[PDB]
Amino acid sequence: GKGIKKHLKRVNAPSHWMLNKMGGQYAPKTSSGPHKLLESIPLVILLRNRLKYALTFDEVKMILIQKIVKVDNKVRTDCTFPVGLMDVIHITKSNEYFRLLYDIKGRFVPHRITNEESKYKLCKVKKILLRKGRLSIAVTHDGRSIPYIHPDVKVNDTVRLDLETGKVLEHLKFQVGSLVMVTAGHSVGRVGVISSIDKNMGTYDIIHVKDSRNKVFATRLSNVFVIGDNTKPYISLPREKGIKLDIIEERRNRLKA
Amino acid sequence: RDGRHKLRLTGGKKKIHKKKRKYELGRPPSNTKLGSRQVHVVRGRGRNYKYRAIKLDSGSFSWPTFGISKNTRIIDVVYNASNNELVRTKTLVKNCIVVIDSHPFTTWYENTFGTTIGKSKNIDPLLLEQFKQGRVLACISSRPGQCGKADGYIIEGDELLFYKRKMDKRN
């Protein structure tokens, strides 16, 4: 037969997983869930290869059996569970809160967050569907369906979501002043202010985004995530703060130590 | 049973590898006659069920100028645009022309409108005479081989004139 493939070769695994060539022949194929395989990491590699808490897949299973780690404040026990673009990971035994984010080099990093911040996740609405009774549901990047969204919410907006109650707290638009984070391009991981939006009829819409140091980079509309307004990002950011640097001058700051 | 083994657009013959797949399928046709209601179940892809009707007597039929649907029984099949064998062997297909009982429609008209929503449509004489006869012409609109039920609407106006001329400068 020719049903669904269920194995992942190591070299065929996504590059940002950073799995080594000689470390076996297979990679953990993420289970279907909230996020795409390409734009997520399984928590097995999250807490084996990144946090180094576990040394083997069996040790990952050992961690997961005890209902300790929670993804969006709810317990996850699947070994190949897709954690996804941005959300909170709570480990109760060590009492630590992580937010999954992108570094300026396009890789998934667990960024330390406070307990207070671990309740404020950001969701990028991807569709607005009205079902029976003129009731509107927002489908987000998280694969999550939020019924009864505020009618002002648009298809490329973002909404702050409360993990405990699963409710929207406020929304964020996509003007030319709303700061965004790029998610999948050459400029994956950059944080900018959106200089302009060019809407091509029937093709990909492009948006030009201005960095903090006034350098402009363009990207596809589907590959951005509104984070905040011009005032500040609504979430905390990794140490680079979404600021990518030219390689010729990353070397100088590497050398000065 | 779909896609390959034909000639190319240029008329050339294409060599055939890739033996037949299941998803190409091609189930045999259902020559739905009219008779005591009997349908079978076909398990299509994804365990979706398709109702293959073999015989029907009745079905929903719509008076479209009033937009009202009533269940009636199919008396005969008299015309079909495709193969003329279909009417002769009395098979029900999607665009078939049938003769159905009009008594439910006449009784409904008497009950609601009186006499023999957006009411007062004024009817037409060509359909009125058919009602007076008691059997009325209709066009099927469902696919009995797919949905398992014959169902259609009463033809009126220019299309009714067209089909009446085509059935019976004429023989």
């Binding site: 029937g202 | 034909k6 479209p64 957006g118 106006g157 085509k166």
Partner: protein
């Protein structure tokens, strides 16, 4: 007058009884012809009148034959780059397109066509706009840079 072969195409979406001719906009900057808007023909495969939706890619081409019913043959001429010799060679290939009767096409005319769902064994494109173009010689012998 409105139908001659064994059919009248119902023109799904026309509506005949309550309402308040059927046509759409197609979009992509193309204007629905006044002939499609007002005329009495009915075409199930017309982009402005039928069920088909224009989605995919838009191509420009030269009409090569309009001698089969409601569908035409478009030849697209282009230059293929041969790397080793660092120069180009003339190349072509023709694509069958559906031409709704709202357009009056003749051999030699440039037409723009939009991709639609497969309407037949070979056609996947529907004409959207026609501008006349006088030709001299066989239409296949012309080379239009488009």
């Amino acid at each position: 007058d409105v139908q001659h072969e064994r059919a009248y195409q119902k023109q799904e979406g026309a509506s005949f009884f309550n309402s308040k001719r059927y046509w759409k906009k197609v979009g992509l900057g193309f204007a629905t012809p006044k002939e499609a808007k007002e005329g009495v023909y009915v075409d199930k495969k017309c982009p402005f009148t039928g069920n088909v939706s224009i989605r995919g890619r838009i191509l420009k081409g030269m009409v090569i034959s309009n001698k089969m019913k409601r569908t035409i043959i478009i030849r697209r001429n282009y230059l293929h780059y041969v790397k080793k010799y660092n120069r180009f060679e003339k190349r072509h290939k023709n694509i069958p397109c559906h031409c709704s009767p709202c357009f009056d096409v003749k051999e030699g005319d440039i037409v723009t066509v939009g991709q639609c769902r497969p309407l037949s064994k070979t056609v996947r494109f529907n004409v959207l706009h026609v501008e006349k173009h006088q030709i001299f010689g066989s239409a296949r012998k012309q080379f239009v840079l488009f």
